[PDB]
Ligand binder design. Sequence first.
Ligand SMILES: CCCCC/C=C\C/C=C\CCCCCCCC(=O)O
Length: 132
Amino acid sequence: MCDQFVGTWKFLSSENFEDYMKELGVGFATRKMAGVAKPNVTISINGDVITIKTESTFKNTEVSFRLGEEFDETTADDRKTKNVITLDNGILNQVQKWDGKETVIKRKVMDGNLVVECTMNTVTSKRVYERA
Ligand SMILES: CCCCC/C=C\C/C=C\CCCCCCCC(=O)O
């Protein structure tokens, strides 16, 4: 149980991410780039501010929030979102809303794997990173 969020993680595998992005409405080309990328995600904490830094990908991002507190974000595929992240039993639950629509991204540490599961409507993807 030193297996906590804080850290850097290296992409390992992916399942169904193509159809999850189709569901989000991401363009054919941006989907291409997202499916070849092998991102590194670094999560850090300072006081009560969490910073998720996504690197080694086609467009690097960085998002800082407090749990329970609404934030704005322009995503890598250029949506203008509203978000609320909360935490429960080790799982960070992110509800991201834009133009009437919603996706839920959940992240949980499993033995130095970070497992990120994204759902929108009917469609789920799982991505697995490993502790760099
Ligand atoms: C953010 C990862 C970089 C590779 C995909 C790139 C950009 C994403 C663009 C459109 C769909 C959003 C995917 C990222 C979801 C949270 C990260 C993850 O599932 O880990």
